[PDB]
Amino acid sequence: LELALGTQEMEAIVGKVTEVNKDTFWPIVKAAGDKPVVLDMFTQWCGPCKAMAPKYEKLAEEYLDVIFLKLDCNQENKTLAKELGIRVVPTFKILKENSVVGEVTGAKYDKLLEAIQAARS
Numbered sequence: 001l002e003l004a005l006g007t008q009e010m011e012a013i014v015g016k017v018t019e020v021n022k023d024t025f026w027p028i029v030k031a032a033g034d035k036p037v038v039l040d041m042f043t044q045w046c047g048p049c050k051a052m053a054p055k056y057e058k059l060a061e062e063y064l065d066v067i068f069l070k071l072d073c074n075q076e077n078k079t080l081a082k083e084l085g086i087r088v089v090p091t092f093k094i095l096k097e098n099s100v101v102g103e104v105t106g107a108k109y110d111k112l113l114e115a116i117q118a119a120r121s
Contacts (some may be wrong), residue, residue, distance in 0.1 A: 001039075005031035007069050010067065017068045022080035025071065029095055032067055036119035037095040040070040041086055049090045050108040056111050059116070066116060094119045 003028050013028075016039075020028060029037050040056055042049035060068040073081045073089060084093055084100070094102035094115050102115040 014064050017057050022077045026082055032059045037067045039093040041091040042075050043073050043089050048091045052107045
């Protein structure tokens with residue numbers, strides 16, 4: 001018996017940035033409907049990653065019809081990471097309907113904002 005997420009849970013996380021793990025990532029993406037999901041893949045030793053954190057949170061406050069998540073690419077999440085295909089940090093993955101539809105590498109907040117606008121159409 002596993003857990004299923006619904007409107008209740010999605011409504012509770014919009015407007016914020018939520019950190020997920022290899023066990024809570026998909027249950028959230030699957031409950032997302034047609035709302036785009038953005039995933040910030042970082043590491044604890046990643047400088048540009050921490051520096052981008054406040055901008056990412058700003059984006060999450062501006063776009064309430066997009067779900068912003070973050071994943072620490074460590075040992076416990078090695079699986080999910082490899083499965084999403086990552087070569088560098090930071091990496092942003094945009095998903096829509098259980099599939100990756102975009103990717104931004106590096107702290108290119110400008111290109112990220114473009115991809116987010118694109119996903120919303």
